[PDB]
């Protein structure tokens, strides 16, 4: 999930890794100890926030989503360029 | 000592919550207020010159 409330909780980690709640602190401590993730969470209730990460293998849904979000970003920058430049070029030049 | 304004802090009796805060940009509102107060005399003096030259 690249967007749409990336913030998560330990229920998915404990559910997918069949581990108890007392070991998730050592799990994220080892995750930060390896050095592949720099996740720092300022949570109050138990939550799981992550940071920069690399797939390193493959992602096809992120290639298609890369084309969708990339074309959306490009047409939005173009829409702002034509919007501002449209009348701005005619009134200021 | 808080009434003496030696540090940032405030007391509490009902809840006992301690809060420490500060306002760094002090030189903005002072210079701005001085510009407004000094320019008020400019506009008033202008109204005195125009009010003198007209009526």
């Amino acid at each position: 999930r690249p967007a749409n409330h990336r913030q998560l909780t330990f229920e998915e980690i404990a559910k997918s890794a069949k581990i108890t709640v007392n070991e998730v602190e050592l799990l994220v401590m080892k995750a930060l100890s390896v050095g592949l993730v720099k996740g720092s969470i300022d949570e109050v209730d138990k939550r799981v926030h992550m940071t920069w990460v690399q797939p390193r293998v493959l992602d096809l849904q992120q290639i298609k989503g890369m084309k969708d979000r990339l074309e959306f970003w490009c047409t939005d920058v173009k829409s702002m360029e034509m919007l501002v430049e449209h009348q701005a070029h005619d009134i200021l030049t | 000592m808080i009434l003496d304004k030696k540090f940032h802090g405030i007391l509490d009796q009902g809840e006992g919550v301690l809060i420490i805060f500060d306002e760094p940009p002090v030189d903005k509102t002072y210079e701005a207020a001085l510009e407004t107060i000094q320019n008020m005399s400019k506009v008033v003096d202008s109204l005195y010159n125009k009010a003198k030259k007209l009526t």
Binding site: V77, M80, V84 | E31, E35, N39, K42, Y48, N49
Partner: protein, 57 residues
């Protein structure tokens, strides 16, 4: 600080301007410098829309 440093004399200007009104003795214009100060101050206004575009998309 320079604006106030000029306004401290601009407070004394309406006296002479209220006494003589004939001839100019000070070679300083006191206007184009403040216009230039406004030009340097318009960078915030011109770049505010830039930050609006960077934040927006």
């Amino acid at each position: 600080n320079y604006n106030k440093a000029v306004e401290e004399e601009d407070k004394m200007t309406p006296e002479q301007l209220a006494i003589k009104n004939v001839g100019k003795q000070d070679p300083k214009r006191h206007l184009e410098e403040h216009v230039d100060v406004l030009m340097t101050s318009n960078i915030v206004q011109c770049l505010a829309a830039m930050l609006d575009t960077v934040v927006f998309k």
